[PDB]
Amino acid sequence: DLSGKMVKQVEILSGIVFYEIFRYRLYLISEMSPVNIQGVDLLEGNWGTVGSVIFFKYTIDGKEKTAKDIVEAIDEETKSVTFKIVEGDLMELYKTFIIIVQVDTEHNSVTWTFHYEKLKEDVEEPNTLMNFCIEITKDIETYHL
Ligand SMILES: [Cl-]
Ligand SMILES: [Cl-]
Ligand SMILES: [Mg+2]
Ligand SMILES: [Mg+2]
């Protein structure tokens, strides 16, 4: 009863840019979605490499939050990257939290997948976080048109 999954596919305008940002230039989101994301700071490793550790300062529902994530997996062929949250506000609610971003690069799309284990049964499904990811996606696609 503690495990959960969420999946949302977002159609976008057209995808190499998106996977460039989430693999190699994640620091760009602070510029593209500056209300939501205050800071993206590499802590260990290189941008775009498995096992790199990234710190995020962000605002959700009017609350300032932080997360530290490790890039647990990359698939260059399917344009996918898997983040594991290891520290931060979300760890007060979830024992494990994994976010998979995958970009289909004609008509392109971004699929967000969350896999998580709640600490306790009464913890909410992370709908708010999913809405946040969707917002970031729309901000990327509409940046400096
Ligand atoms: Cl690598
Ligand atoms: Cl992956
Ligand atoms: Mg894989
Ligand atoms: Mg913990």
PDB file of C-alpha atoms and ligand atoms in Angstrom:
ATOM      1  CA  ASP A   1       0.000   0.000   0.000  1.00  0.00           C
ATOM      2  CA  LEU A   2       2.909   2.476   0.216  1.00  0.00           C
ATOM      3  CA  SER A   3       4.235   2.319  -3.368  1.00  0.00           C
ATOM      4  CA  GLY A   4       2.853   4.456  -6.169  1.00  0.00           C
ATOM      5  CA  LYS A   5       3.420   5.553  -9.742  1.00  0.00           C
ATOM      6  CA  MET A   6       2.269   8.552 -11.794  1.00  0.00           C
ATOM      7  CA  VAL A   7       2.691   9.038 -15.527  1.00  0.00           C
ATOM      8  CA  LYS A   8       1.958  12.132 -17.591  1.00  0.00           C
ATOM      9  CA  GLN A   9       2.701  12.659 -21.259  1.00  0.00           C
ATOM     10  CA  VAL A  10       2.859  16.282 -22.471  1.00  0.00           C
ATOM     11  CA  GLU A  11       2.785  17.066 -26.215  1.00  0.00           C
ATOM     12  CA  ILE A  12       5.313  19.769 -27.070  1.00  0.00           C
ATOM     13  CA  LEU A  13       6.111  21.869 -30.193  1.00  0.00           C
ATOM     14  CA  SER A  14       9.348  20.145 -31.392  1.00  0.00           C
ATOM     15  CA  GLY A  15      12.370  17.682 -28.499  1.00  0.00           C
ATOM     16  CA  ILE A  16      16.160  17.733 -28.915  1.00  0.00           C
ATOM     17  CA  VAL A  17      16.206  20.961 -26.883  1.00  0.00           C
ATOM     18  CA  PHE A  18      14.274  19.375 -24.095  1.00  0.00           C
ATOM     19  CA  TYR A  19      16.596  16.442 -23.734  1.00  0.00           C
ATOM     20  CA  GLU A  20      19.599  18.793 -23.967  1.00  0.00           C
ATOM     21  CA  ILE A  21      18.223  20.711 -21.038  1.00  0.00           C
ATOM     22  CA  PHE A  22      17.437  17.704 -18.821  1.00  0.00           C
ATOM     23  CA  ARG A  23      20.617  15.863 -19.587  1.00  0.00           C
ATOM     24  CA  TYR A  24      23.281  18.470 -20.098  1.00  0.00           C
ATOM     25  CA  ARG A  25      22.093  21.992 -19.291  1.00  0.00           C
ATOM     26  CA  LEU A  26      19.662  21.604 -16.430  1.00  0.00           C
ATOM     27  CA  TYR A  27      20.802  24.983 -15.067  1.00  0.00           C
ATOM     28  CA  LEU A  28      18.832  26.569 -17.900  1.00  0.00           C
ATOM     29  CA  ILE A  29      15.505  25.860 -16.208  1.00  0.00           C
ATOM     30  CA  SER A  30      16.229  28.524 -13.585  1.00  0.00           C
ATOM     31  CA  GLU A  31      16.156  31.041 -16.462  1.00  0.00           C
ATOM     32  CA  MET A  32      13.205  29.477 -18.351  1.00  0.00           C
ATOM     33  CA  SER A  33      10.920  28.913 -15.335  1.00  0.00           C
ATOM     34  CA  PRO A  34      12.222  31.437 -12.840  1.00  0.00           C
ATOM     35  CA  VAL A  35       9.054  31.560 -10.630  1.00  0.00           C
ATOM     36  CA  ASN A  36       9.255  27.816 -10.009  1.00  0.00           C
ATOM     37  CA  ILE A  37      13.056  27.199  -9.996  1.00  0.00           C
ATOM     38  CA  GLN A  38      15.441  29.447  -8.108  1.00  0.00           C
ATOM     39  CA  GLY A  39      18.639  27.545  -8.438  1.00  0.00           C
ATOM     40  CA  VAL A  40      20.109  24.423 -10.028  1.00  0.00           C
ATOM     41  CA  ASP A  41      23.639  23.697  -8.783  1.00  0.00           C
ATOM     42  CA  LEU A  42      25.854  20.764  -9.756  1.00  0.00           C
ATOM     43  CA  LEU A  43      27.481  19.297  -6.624  1.00  0.00           C
ATOM     44  CA  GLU A  44      29.382  16.282  -7.923  1.00  0.00           C
ATOM     45  CA  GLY A  45      30.268  14.908 -11.247  1.00  0.00           C
ATOM     46  CA  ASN A  46      29.732  16.505 -14.623  1.00  0.00           C
ATOM     47  CA  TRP A  47      26.470  17.738 -16.140  1.00  0.00           C
ATOM     48  CA  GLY A  48      25.031  14.922 -18.214  1.00  0.00           C
ATOM     49  CA  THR A  49      26.740  11.965 -16.591  1.00  0.00           C
ATOM     50  CA  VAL A  50      25.398   9.045 -14.623  1.00  0.00           C
ATOM     51  CA  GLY A  51      25.912   9.522 -10.914  1.00  0.00           C
ATOM     52  CA  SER A  52      26.063  13.330 -11.035  1.00  0.00           C
ATOM     53  CA  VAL A  53      24.505  15.051  -7.976  1.00  0.00           C
ATOM     54  CA  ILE A  54      22.412  18.174  -8.415  1.00  0.00           C
ATOM     55  CA  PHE A  55      20.911  20.535  -5.862  1.00  0.00           C
ATOM     56  CA  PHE A  56      17.575  22.267  -6.666  1.00  0.00           C
ATOM     57  CA  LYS A  57      16.074  25.321  -4.940  1.00  0.00           C
ATOM     58  CA  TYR A  58      12.421  25.659  -5.922  1.00  0.00           C
ATOM     59  CA  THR A  59       9.063  27.113  -4.942  1.00  0.00           C
ATOM     60  CA  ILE A  60       5.868  25.096  -5.015  1.00  0.00           C
ATOM     61  CA  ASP A  61       2.423  26.033  -3.584  1.00  0.00           C
ATOM     62  CA  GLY A  62       4.070  29.193  -2.185  1.00  0.00           C
ATOM     63  CA  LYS A  63       6.645  27.166  -0.236  1.00  0.00           C
ATOM     64  CA  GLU A  64      10.415  27.258  -0.664  1.00  0.00           C
ATOM     65  CA  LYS A  65      11.864  23.783  -0.943  1.00  0.00           C
ATOM     66  CA  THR A  66      15.142  22.107  -1.718  1.00  0.00           C
ATOM     67  CA  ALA A  67      16.096  18.756  -3.188  1.00  0.00           C
ATOM     68  CA  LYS A  68      19.331  16.936  -3.892  1.00  0.00           C
ATOM     69  CA  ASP A  69      19.126  14.400  -6.660  1.00  0.00           C
ATOM     70  CA  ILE A  70      21.423  11.848  -8.172  1.00  0.00           C
ATOM     71  CA  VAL A  71      21.256  10.995 -11.865  1.00  0.00           C
ATOM     72  CA  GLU A  72      20.765   7.260 -11.542  1.00  0.00           C
ATOM     73  CA  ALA A  73      20.295   6.413 -15.168  1.00  0.00           C
ATOM     74  CA  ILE A  74      20.651   7.827 -18.692  1.00  0.00           C
ATOM     75  CA  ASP A  75      19.482   6.342 -21.941  1.00  0.00           C
ATOM     76  CA  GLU A  76      20.799   8.392 -24.875  1.00  0.00           C
ATOM     77  CA  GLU A  77      18.863   6.423 -27.498  1.00  0.00           C
ATOM     78  CA  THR A  78      15.399   6.921 -25.981  1.00  0.00           C
ATOM     79  CA  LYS A  79      16.370  10.340 -24.666  1.00  0.00           C
ATOM     80  CA  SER A  80      15.642   9.426 -21.086  1.00  0.00           C
ATOM     81  CA  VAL A  81      17.095  10.477 -17.720  1.00  0.00           C
ATOM     82  CA  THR A  82      16.280   9.105 -14.312  1.00  0.00           C
ATOM     83  CA  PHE A  83      16.694  11.217 -11.151  1.00  0.00           C
ATOM     84  CA  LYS A  84      16.594   9.864  -7.613  1.00  0.00           C
ATOM     85  CA  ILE A  85      15.779  12.322  -4.819  1.00  0.00           C
ATOM     86  CA  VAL A  86      18.159  11.655  -1.929  1.00  0.00           C
ATOM     87  CA  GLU A  87      17.701  14.681   0.277  1.00  0.00           C
ATOM     88  CA  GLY A  88      15.240  17.462   0.790  1.00  0.00           C
ATOM     89  CA  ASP A  89      11.696  18.386   1.748  1.00  0.00           C
ATOM     90  CA  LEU A  90      10.150  15.453  -0.153  1.00  0.00           C
ATOM     91  CA  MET A  91      12.146  13.019   1.989  1.00  0.00           C
ATOM     92  CA  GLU A  92       9.940  14.053   4.939  1.00  0.00           C
ATOM     93  CA  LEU A  93       7.074  12.286   3.135  1.00  0.00           C
ATOM     94  CA  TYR A  94       8.551   9.633   0.848  1.00  0.00           C
ATOM     95  CA  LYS A  95      11.112   6.996   1.600  1.00  0.00           C
ATOM     96  CA  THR A  96      12.095   6.799  -2.102  1.00  0.00           C
ATOM     97  CA  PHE A  97      11.257   9.097  -4.967  1.00  0.00           C
ATOM     98  CA  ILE A  98      12.368   8.584  -8.584  1.00  0.00           C
ATOM     99  CA  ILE A  99      11.541  10.863 -11.523  1.00  0.00           C
ATOM    100  CA  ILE A 100      12.036   9.646 -15.114  1.00  0.00           C
ATOM    101  CA  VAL A 101      11.907  12.201 -17.914  1.00  0.00           C
ATOM    102  CA  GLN A 102      11.740  10.832 -21.446  1.00  0.00           C
ATOM    103  CA  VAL A 103      11.540  12.806 -24.652  1.00  0.00           C
ATOM    104  CA  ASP A 104      10.168  11.484 -27.931  1.00  0.00           C
ATOM    105  CA  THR A 105      12.124  13.361 -30.650  1.00  0.00           C
ATOM    106  CA  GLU A 106       7.321  15.082 -36.328  1.00  0.00           C
ATOM    107  CA  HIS A 107       5.090  15.284 -33.210  1.00  0.00           C
ATOM    108  CA  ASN A 108       7.231  15.271 -30.101  1.00  0.00           C
ATOM    109  CA  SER A 109       6.395  14.800 -26.443  1.00  0.00           C
ATOM    110  CA  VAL A 110       7.797  14.577 -22.932  1.00  0.00           C
ATOM    111  CA  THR A 111       6.732  11.852 -20.580  1.00  0.00           C
ATOM    112  CA  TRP A 112       7.143  12.319 -16.826  1.00  0.00           C
ATOM    113  CA  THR A 113       7.060   9.170 -14.641  1.00  0.00           C
ATOM    114  CA  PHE A 114       7.226   9.156 -10.867  1.00  0.00           C
ATOM    115  CA  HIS A 115       7.958   6.039  -8.852  1.00  0.00           C
ATOM    116  CA  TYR A 116       7.711   6.456  -5.127  1.00  0.00           C
ATOM    117  CA  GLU A 117       7.352   4.781  -1.719  1.00  0.00           C
ATOM    118  CA  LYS A 118       5.480   6.754   0.896  1.00  0.00           C
ATOM    119  CA  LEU A 119       6.675   6.759   4.485  1.00  0.00           C
ATOM    120  CA  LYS A 120       3.078   6.256   5.801  1.00  0.00           C
ATOM    121  CA  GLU A 121      -0.269   5.338   4.197  1.00  0.00           C
ATOM    122  CA  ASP A 122      -1.797   8.761   4.717  1.00  0.00           C
ATOM    123  CA  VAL A 123       0.838  10.590   2.635  1.00  0.00           C
ATOM    124  CA  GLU A 124      -0.708  12.211  -0.471  1.00  0.00           C
ATOM    125  CA  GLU A 125      -0.067  11.201  -4.056  1.00  0.00           C
ATOM    126  CA  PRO A 126       2.439  13.800  -5.459  1.00  0.00           C
ATOM    127  CA  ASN A 127      -0.088  15.508  -7.748  1.00  0.00           C
ATOM    128  CA  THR A 128       1.286  18.922  -6.912  1.00  0.00           C
ATOM    129  CA  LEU A 129       4.767  17.902  -7.984  1.00  0.00           C
ATOM    130  CA  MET A 130       3.407  16.515 -11.228  1.00  0.00           C
ATOM    131  CA  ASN A 131       1.614  19.790 -11.938  1.00  0.00           C
ATOM    132  CA  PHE A 132       4.946  21.543 -11.238  1.00  0.00           C
ATOM    133  CA  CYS A 133       6.793  19.365 -13.763  1.00  0.00           C
ATOM    134  CA  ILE A 134       4.067  20.048 -16.399  1.00  0.00           C
ATOM    135  CA  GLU A 135       4.435  23.813 -15.729  1.00  0.00           C
ATOM    136  CA  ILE A 136       8.204  23.591 -16.188  1.00  0.00           C
ATOM    137  CA  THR A 137       7.656  21.739 -19.426  1.00  0.00           C
ATOM    138  CA  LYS A 138       5.280  24.469 -20.750  1.00  0.00           C
ATOM    139  CA  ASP A 139       7.758  27.152 -19.656  1.00  0.00           C
ATOM    140  CA  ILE A 140      10.526  25.482 -21.632  1.00  0.00           C
ATOM    141  CA  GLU A 141       8.448  25.156 -24.736  1.00  0.00           C
ATOM    142  CA  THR A 142       7.343  28.800 -24.657  1.00  0.00           C
ATOM    143  CA  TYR A 143      10.694  30.450 -23.678  1.00  0.00           C
ATOM    144  CA  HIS A 144      11.693  33.502 -25.816  1.00  0.00           C
ATOM    145  CA  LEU A 145       9.437  32.876 -28.791  1.00  0.00           C
TER     146      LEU A 145
HETATM  147 CL    CL B   1      27.761   8.683 -18.091  1.00  0.00          CL
HETATM  148 CL    CL B   2      16.796   6.672 -17.961  1.00  0.00          CL
HETATM  149 MG    MG B   3      17.161   2.460 -18.565  1.00  0.00          MG
HETATM  150 MG    MG B   4      14.569   8.811   4.190  1.00  0.00          MG
END
